[PDB]
Write a protein that binds this ligand. Structure first.
Ligand code: NA
Lengths: 312, 312
């Protein structure tokens, strides 16, 4: 009988989009069965975000989400911090293993509200079908100088693989990552942007805590000879060779998002081998996708917003 | 009670500078006698800011302040809202009455953290010696295009006079304003910056609620022919003919301040008849100033920070 707002005291600082295209700005005492609701398990309550592979998407995306967006925006220079503790309960059980996005779900992001509307960070959990352990990795998308159709993401592994580890054919998978994270296994992230520098921390009991620093005010990617080999390789059949503006996301307004942003869709892999995953979507029927594994589902027990801080 | 943080639940969102030059970042359970403390009166507790006319000033100013500064900064596009209810209990009883800033105290501001470090708004209370009623007015400072030494403030009256109404000699005063606010009389302000537009609301029991709208993204002062007449009298002595850059404070990082920023100092009126007030400051001896009326003291009942909101 609980609402998610009973578990997240800053619920009034978020709006939501659900997998069925519902937008809701006032989330105090709000739930909707099968998308955004509370689940009780032994001694903890969790906020569930559940979304199919193909529901009603936002105008900005081909992928379906049930995900919060922070109402108060900020530029990297003034900063912001998001802390989450969560477990992924389910990712799509179908999709083409040659496509980097298949079988994954983004569980936190910074999204830009203007300009190209790209993401300085998207944190993913990806698990191939049949595997016990999945991978957590995070992607930085360039704030492309000029035409955004040449953009790309650079993916960095936390536990397990990064997004570039694909199967060599549509239904054969790499071996499971030995150091990865199971469904139902708790982990935490913090995204702390202080004075334009994004400091990430990822922790999970029994695994190494892993930290990263990425300056969001000065690009590392301002010419062709700076594009990482990972981009040349993973985007080789797409054609993406953009460069990033010199000052990256300096002064660009953005905001946090958190929940289940499903990156497995039913688009044809031939149209985009990195992001169109060709999964089973049952012609958009949400109840049939839910009955056959064609969805993602992520549970959070803590989601806190605060100000950016100097790492100690 | 004793700590101002028992009255202001958001005390951890502010830092302070006191009139003796003390800076303190963590204000929970913090008070300093004679500067920042709580006074109980009839059935309400108030947070008191008290400052001499000449204490230890910030590097940025010739005036002394005991004043909060908001820790988390913002640009006008993303916005912010400050609400306060207060009463002014004392302004300096000495000063050259010809000088526009004399006998006044700023009780709320937006202050820029970069660039020229100018203020999109400072809210003043000013009361000539011996008057019962003082005036509340607010100043917008241009974000000067080019050299800031040509900057100026434009003052708009709320109740009573604006800053430009001065006495005819150093020691005599204009008539009391018909509509002003007495020492000890409560009034409220709200500075609500939503999508770059500043909406002000001022209210006090038994006076008209007054509202203003000022766009902080698009200057009304881009040509010399737009400089208001007011500036031509006040600033005649001083060389201030600047114009403002076209997009005003767009993208410039700001934050709110609230407290007692005393505008009466001991500087020579013959050097600057707008800001150099020639008051008695007893060689910077704070005790002697407090004993002889050379100070400002403002009590707040409420002080809340929030997001900017669309008016309605
Ligand atoms: Na901001």
């Amino acid at each position: 009988t609980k609402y998610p707002s009973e578990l997240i005291p800053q619920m009034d600082e978020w709006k939501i989009l659900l997998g069925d295209g519902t937008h809701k700005e006032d989330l105090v005492n709000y739930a909707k069965d099968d998308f955004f609701y509370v689940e009780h398990e032994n001694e903890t309550d969790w906020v569930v975000f559940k979304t199919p592979n193909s529901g009603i998407t936002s105008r900005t995306s081909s992928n379906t989400r049930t995900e919060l967006g922070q109402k108060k925006h900020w530029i990297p220079e003034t900063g912001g911090k998001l802390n989450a503790t969560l477990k992924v309960q389910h990712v799509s059980t179908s999709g083409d293993a040659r496509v980097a996005a298949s079988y994954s779900v983004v569980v936190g992001q910074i999204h830009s509200d203007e300009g190209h509307e790209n993401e300085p960070i998207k944190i993913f959990y990806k698990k191939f079908p049949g595997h016990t352990k999945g991978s957590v990795f995070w992607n930085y998308e360039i704030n492309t100088k000029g035409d955004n159709s040449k953009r790309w993401d650079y993916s960095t592994a936390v536990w397990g693989y990064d997004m570039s580890v694909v199967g060599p054919t549509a239904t054969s998978y790499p071996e499971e990552p030995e150091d990865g994270i199971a469904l139902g296994e708790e982990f935490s992230y913090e995204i702390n942007v202080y004075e334009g520098i994004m400091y990430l921390t990822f922790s999970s009991e029994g695994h190494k805590t892993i930290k990263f620093t990425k300056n969001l005010l000065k690009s590392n990617f301002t010419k062709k000879s700076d594009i990482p080999q990972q981009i040349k390789t993973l985007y080789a059949s797409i054609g993406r060779d953009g460069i990033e503006r010199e000052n990256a996301y300096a002064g660009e307004i953005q905001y946090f998002k958190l929940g289940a942003y499903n990156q497995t869709n039913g688009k044809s892999p031939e149209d985009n081998l990195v992001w169109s995953t060709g999964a089973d979507v049952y012609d958009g029927d949400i109840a049939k996708q839910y009955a056959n594994g064609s969805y993602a589902e992520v549970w959070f027990k803590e989601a806190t917003l605060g100000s950016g801080s100097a790492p100690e």
